[PDB]
Amino acid sequence: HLTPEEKSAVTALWGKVNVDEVGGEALGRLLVVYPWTQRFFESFGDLSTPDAVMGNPKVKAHGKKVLGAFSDGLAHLDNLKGTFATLSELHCDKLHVDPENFRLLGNVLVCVLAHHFGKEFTPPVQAAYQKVVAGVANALAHKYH
Amino acid sequence: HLTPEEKSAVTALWGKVNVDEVGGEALGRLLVVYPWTQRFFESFGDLSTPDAVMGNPKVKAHGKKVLGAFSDGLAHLDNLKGTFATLSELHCDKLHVDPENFRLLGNVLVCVLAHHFGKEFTPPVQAAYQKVVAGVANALAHKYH
Amino acid sequence: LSPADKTNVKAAWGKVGAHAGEYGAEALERMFLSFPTTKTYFPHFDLSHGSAQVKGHGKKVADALTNAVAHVDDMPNALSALSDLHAHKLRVDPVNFKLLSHCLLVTLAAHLPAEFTPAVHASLDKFLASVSTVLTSKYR
Amino acid sequence: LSPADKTNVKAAWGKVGAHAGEYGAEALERMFLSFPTTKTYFPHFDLSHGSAQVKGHGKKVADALTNAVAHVDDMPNALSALSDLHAHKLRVDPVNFKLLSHCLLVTLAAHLPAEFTPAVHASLDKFLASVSTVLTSKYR
Numbered sequence: 001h002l003t004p005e006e007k008s009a010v011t012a013l014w015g016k017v018n019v020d021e022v023g024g025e026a027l028g029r030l031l032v033v034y035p036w037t038q039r040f041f042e043s044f045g046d047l048s049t050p051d052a053v054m055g056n057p058k059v060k061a062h063g064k065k066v067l068g069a070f071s072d073g074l075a076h077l078d079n080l081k082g083t084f085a086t087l088s089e090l091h092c093d094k095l096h097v098d099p100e101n102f103r104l105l106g107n108v109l110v111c112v113l114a115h116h117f118g119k120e121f122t123p124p125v126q127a128a129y130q131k132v133v134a135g136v137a138n139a140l141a142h143k144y145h
Numbered sequence: 146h147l148t149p150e151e152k153s154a155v156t157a158l159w160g161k162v163n164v165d166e167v168g169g170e171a172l173g174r175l176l177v178v179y180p181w182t183q184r185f186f187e188s189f190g191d192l193s194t195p196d197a198v199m200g201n202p203k204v205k206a207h208g209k210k211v212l213g214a215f216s217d218g219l220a221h222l223d224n225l226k227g228t229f230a231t232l233s234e235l236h237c238d239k240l241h242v243d244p245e246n247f248r249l250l251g252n253v254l255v256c257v258l259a260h261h262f263g264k265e266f267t268p269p270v271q272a273a274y275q276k277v278v279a280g281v282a283n284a285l286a287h288k289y290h
Numbered sequence: 291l292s293p294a295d296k297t298n299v300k301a302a303w304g305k306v307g308a309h310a311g312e313y314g315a316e317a318l319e320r321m322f323l324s325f326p327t328t329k330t331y332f333p334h335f336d337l338s339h340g341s342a343q344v345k346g347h348g349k350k351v352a353d354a355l356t357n358a359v360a361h362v363d364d365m366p367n368a369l370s371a372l373s374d375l376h377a378h379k380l381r382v383d384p385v386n387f388k389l390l391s392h393c394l395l396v397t398l399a400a401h402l403p404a405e406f407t408p409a410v411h412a413s414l415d416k417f418l419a420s421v422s423t424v425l426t427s428k429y430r
Numbered sequence: 431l432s433p434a435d436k437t438n439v440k441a442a443w444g445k446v447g448a449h450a451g452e453y454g455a456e457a458l459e460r461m462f463l464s465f466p467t468t469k470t471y472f473p474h475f476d477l478s479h480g481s482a483q484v485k486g487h488g489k490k491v492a493d494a495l496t497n498a499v500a501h502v503d504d505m506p507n508a509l510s511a512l513s514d515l516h517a518h519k520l521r522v523d524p525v526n527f528k529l530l531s532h533c534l535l536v537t538l539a540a541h542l543p544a545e546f547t548p549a550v551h552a553s554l555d556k557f558l559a560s561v562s563t564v565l566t567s568k569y570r
């Protein structure tokens with residue numbers, strides 16, 4: 001739940017996000033900044049150095065997948081649980097990703113937005129996206145709860 | 146969401162719990178082990194040394210109210226969100242408590258149940274109580290989500 | 291903390307310059323707007339946009355970090371005075387440090403894009419974390 | 431970490447003694463049963479009750495803590511070989527460390543009542559947070 005000014009800011013800035021190098025930059029930085037997340041992607045090959053991760057095609061392609069889900073959820077703001085239900089049980093039941101890593105990826109995404117948009121990603125715009133990423137992270141952790 | 150045998154073990158051990166002391170001990174241990182939690186209890190007084198926290202009459206009396214809230218939760222394991230509706234609102238909107246502190250108090254309670262029951266508190270018994278204290282914390286965190 | 295993480299932080303904060311006081315102020319500004327619960331720790335303060343109290347406290351926060359980068363191996367002894375403030379008197383929930391550490395990372399990425407590389411970012415998140423753990427080190 | 435904590439941790443392991451390997455094995459079983467996710471790091475292991483390999487692995491975790499309590503002041507260099515296999519090879523989530531520390535505290539609580547006091551509890555949890563911080567200090 002958020003104000004229409006937040007709804008406008010979150011959608012206007014997401015319209016500038018292309019196509020996507022942001023998805024790969026976020027998944028990449030999660031594997032770099034928090035290396036324990038690499039275990040879930042052991043079949044992606046080399047992830048030994050930050051460059052190996054950023055230059056990984058399997059990471060880049062999977063990056064496109066994760067950011068695509070965010071875009072889907074950004075339309076279905078009012079119902080985040082039903083939208084991410086088909087993905088919550090995946091990560092929960094047998095993939096076994098600790099729900100803290102959901103909040104880490106959300107925050108890393110927010111860092112990528114600040115990196116790519118700069119001064120455009122103003123503090124009230126960050127605040128709006130925070131409510132969104134907390135939402136997505138909670139929606140992807142409903143199956144554990 | 147527990148096994149029938151788990152519910153038998155949980156209720157059996159709980160019926161042997163000293164309602165007068167176990168509560169105050171869990172709250173006391175929380176304030177000694179994690180002393181940032183003392184910011185929510187400065188009205189209680191003497192919390193300087195570990196000996197003062199455990200002797201504190203308000204920590205003991207309040208601990209008793211907290212243990213009561215766990216008992217309620219055990220009685221209605223299938224309606225935890227509902228059992229802690231006013232408390233989730235109180236702890237979230239009124240008190241500011243971070244949901245991670247609920248997870249810590251529950252874990253300190255498990256330590257207290259191990260300290261009082263010894264070898265009677267076997268690993269499958271703890272396994273069943275982890276599901277409970279995780280349930281209570283999640284339900285007590287429902288108002289942010 | 292790694293030797294490579296030590297140079298990565300030293301290079302990135304060496305490029306913040308005297309505008310560190312503004313970056314700290316921005317980070318605070320961000321934390322208050324993004325996580326309003328963190329405002330309980332500041333009743334004595336005015337947290338509106340462009341406030342002198344936020345700019346002054348931002349300077350206090352950033353200079354403490356400049357003191358931290360210089361004493362990368364001497365952190366529990368150099369930031370001892372502040373560990374007494376944050377852990378003994380303020381008793382700030384360790385979660386709040388995670389929120390400010392995050393907001394600062396956002397500020398750095400926004401103002402210094404060429405510097406904010408995945409390798410630099412990782413070293414800073416590690417740096418801020420070990421700074422955070424020192425300020426919340428001894429509680430009894 | 432205060433030397434007041436040391437007069438509790440060292441004295442606590444003084445009542446542990448030979449039962450170290452025994453308590454380490456119980457903590458791992460407590461962890462596997464209470465948190466079935468931690469099992470992912472052990473598919474090449476027999477996780478059944480009374481398994482000699484969990485018992486043997488328990489002894490290893492136990493002496494590693496005895497080695498850590500000895501070299502308390504300079505813990506990163508002492509457990510660097512451990513920091514190399516957990517962080518780099520196995521890629522263990524830091525949460526799983528909090529889980530083993532909790533289970534280790536539950537074991538000590540269940541076996542040493544007069545010895546598991548609020549002071550020792552706080553001192554052991556701090557020490558366990560530190561030991562698990564050392565096996566998380568080198569992440570790239």
Ligand code: HEM
Pocket residue numbers: 182185186210211212214215232236240242246247248250251281282285
């Ligand atoms: C997770 C288990 C917890 C349970 C079951 C629990 C339960 C309760 C209950 C039943 C009360 C009594 C409400 C009242 O006085 O009317 C209470 C009050 C309170 N709790 Fe919690 N609590 C828990 C965790 C926490 C934690 C972790 C903190 C802080 C670190 C906290 C801080 C407080 C405070 C400050 C009050 C005083 C409320 C008042 O008297 O107005 N609680 N809690």
Ligand code: HEM
Pocket residue numbers: 328331332334347350351352354355372375376380382386387388390391421422425
């Ligand atoms: C990056 C980590 C942090 C650093 C380096 C930092 C640094 C400082 C410094 C240098 C001071 C002033 C020193 C003095 O007055 O003697 C200060 C004060 C304070 N800090 Fe922190 N701080 C940090 C994080 C936090 C967080 C996360 C909070 C709460 C959410 C917080 C709350 C306070 C408060 C309440 C004061 C006193 C403010 C005043 O009355 O002037 N700090 N901090």
Ligand code: HNI
Pocket residue numbers: 037038040041065066067069070087091095097101102103105106136137140
């Ligand atoms: C660190 C682990 C991790 C995190 C934090 C994470 C966080 C997220 C978040 C935000 C919280 C979202 C929206 C998201 C979205 C996705 N993930 Ni996640 N994923 C993670 C590990 C995976 C893995 C692993 C897969 C593939 C599963 C497999 O068996 O290969 C995955 C697959 C996906 C898919 C593709 C579905 C499919 O298999 O067809 C999407 C979409 N995801 N993941």
Ligand code: HNI
Pocket residue numbers: 468471472487490491494495512516520522526527530561562
């Ligand atoms: C759940 C994951 C996990 C955690 C939290 C964890 C936490 C700890 C802690 C925390 C206090 C300590 C002191 C510790 C110590 C050890 N671990 Ni850990 N280990 C873990 C997974 C392992 C695995 C996996 C191995 C390899 C065992 C084997 O033989 O295959 C391991 C091996 C060891 C060894 C043996 C290495 C050797 O032979 O030199 C020691 C000692 N450890 N581990």
